[PDB]
Amino acid sequence: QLRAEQTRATIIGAAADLFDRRGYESTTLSEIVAHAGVTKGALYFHFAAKEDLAHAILEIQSRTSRRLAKDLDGRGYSSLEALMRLTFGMARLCVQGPVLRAGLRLATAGVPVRPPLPHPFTEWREIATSRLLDAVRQSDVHQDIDVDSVAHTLVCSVVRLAEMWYILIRGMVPVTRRARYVTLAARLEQET
Template identity: 35%
Template sequence: MQARSERSRRRLVRAAAEMFDAHGYADATLGRIAQAAGMTKGALYFHFGSKDGLADAVQEQGHELLRRQVRALDAAGTPPVQGLIDLTHRLARGLREDPVVRAGFRITVECAGRRPPVADLHAAWVREAARLLERAREAGRLRDGVGDDGPRALLAAVVCGISGAWGAGLSTAELASRVAALWATLLPALVPPGEQERYRTQAPSGARGRRGAGAGADGGAGGGAGTREARSAA
């Protein structure tokens, strides 16, 4: 019974994410969400007392997706600068392919100022990126003289830019190419001279989509050599 209830809850959260993504918070009514989930409105109210509760559940699922990405990077021993690059690529793919991520960003914008405040998925991505940046600093992988404010502001702009580029309707491959070009420009300003080549700016294999076949199993742009360099930077 409990497993069935949890499945129903997941269906509702998924349907809510799709409705918020497609129609926005204001126009995604509980009736439409219940219908999209193949459930009655009464069944919806059994799990969620309000649309705000559903919005929070969608945001929490978006946070969990982010936490999984971060845990995967940590488990793989990915150097922090490479992890930062890969995290932004995974955000780009999530915005292109996952309605939960898109809905989370849209809810953040449309519910700004709500009391109690809605969970801020955009801010969560910026915080994780800042954490990786600080780890890179502690490991001595940033240029001398690189302060805190500039890179943090830059990361916030990168996250905003990725979400804006997705809104332009780019394909997964096109968006990955834009993010790679962005990092090719940013890396010289962040890492010490001569260390830019340590890092792969292309999307890892898991964040390229189907057309990413042909990359190394670990996502290196040119196979093993680029990946060995990235790992040696840890």
């Protein structure tokens, strides 16, 4: 059993890589099993169908982003700092995580999300929104900003990161608090 249980990461990785480069609809179980170097039995031991590989990848993206959001809100940061760190953080895990790229690709396409797993974009919007409200509440973002709209755009925008942050910073952050944020965006770009 141990052997079988041990192949699941490989199969996910293999399917991630293929879904990310070649797309979901065009990738088959057979392609996946040959890339992974395992048998069909090994694959069926963990997943009954292609869709199950999809929901597992989607599951990992959702958990990954929810974990990072939670971790970053427990470290004494201001909300906008947390939000900024979160965009750069996600970007760092994606540049090095095929699974997340595959998740992204599945989410961007019409690949359904099995309830109660919410669609990652609405989850990313929720995070961005609550973070922006707090930032408004802490005077880091103008009181008149329409948060909803920026969350909606921000999510689309994150999917150059520093350069985007600079524009938002100039346009939504009060003059006296800008510098700290411009500095952080620079440091995070430097650090990733």
